[PDB]
Amino acid sequence: KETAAAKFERQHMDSSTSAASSSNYCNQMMKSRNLTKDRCKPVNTFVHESLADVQAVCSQKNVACKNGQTNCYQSYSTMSITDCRETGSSKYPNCAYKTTQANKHIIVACEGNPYVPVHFDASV
Ligand SMILES: [Cl-]
Ligand SMILES: [Cl-]
Ligand SMILES: [Cl-]
Ligand SMILES: [Cl-]
Ligand SMILES: [Cl-]
Ligand SMILES: [Cl-]
Ligand SMILES: [Cl-]
Ligand SMILES: [Cl-]
Ligand SMILES: [Cl-]
Ligand SMILES: [Cs+]
Ligand SMILES: [Cs+]
Ligand SMILES: [Cs+]
Ligand SMILES: [Cs+]
């Protein structure tokens, strides 16, 4: 049902805060964005920038995706991001996440018309 664009927005956009608040940011967000529903999503990154700024990345530096596809774009500037990764104590259905806040260039795969992000590849 969910569009590729809307899935990206749900998993990766958090324009409501400038940066991760607290060590419990990832537990709260991973749950609230429905990323812990049937299993604990092991790794997920949230971007703390406007949706317009993340979308604009699709007309920035064209770079290879890790899988060798050619529709990835690297942000010209660094962006506030939070990486959420499961800890060793994480056991579904009590998922647990480490929160790491950082300022990194993001790399996204773009598709469609409008040409928008559909996958978070990596950050640098
Ligand atoms: Cl959409
Ligand atoms: Cl805002
Ligand atoms: Cl949902
Ligand atoms: Cl999941
Ligand atoms: Cl991710
Ligand atoms: Cl675990
Ligand atoms: Cl859960
Ligand atoms: Cl269209
Ligand atoms: Cl990903
Ligand atoms: Cs920001
Ligand atoms: Cs914690
Ligand atoms: Cs929710
Ligand atoms: Cs391209």
**Bound molecule types:** chloride ion, cesium ion
State the end-to-end distance. Answer: 32 Å
Number of separate structural domains: 1
What is the 3D shape? globular
Write the CATH architecture name: Roll
Give the SSE layout.
Layout: H1 4-12, H2 25-32, E1 43-47, H3 51-56, E2 61-63, E3 72-74, E4 79-86, E5 97-104, E6 106-111, E7 116-123
Antiparallel strand pairs: 1-4, 2-3, 3-6, 4-5, 6-7
What can you tell me about this protein's structure?
It is classed as hydrolase. The entry lists the keywords carboplatin, ribonucleases, protein platination, hydrolase. The assembly is monomeric. The X-ray structure of bovine pancreatic ribonuclease incubated in the presence of an excess of carboplatin (1:10 ratio). The protein is Ribonuclease pancreatic. The organism is Bos taurus. With about 120 residues, this protein is an alpha+beta fold. The chain has a single domain, classed as P-30 Protein. Helix content is about 20%, strand content about 35%. It has three helices and seven strands, in the order ααβαββββββ. The protein has helices at about 5-10, 25-30, 50-55; strands at about 45, 60-65, 70-75, 80-85, 95-105, 105-110, 115-124. The strands form two sheets. It has a four-stranded antiparallel β-sheet. A three-stranded antiparallel β-sheet has the order 1-4-5, covered by helices on one side. The longest helix has 9 residues, at about 5-10. It is globular and about 40 Å long. It binds chloride ion (9 copies) and cesium ion (4 copies).
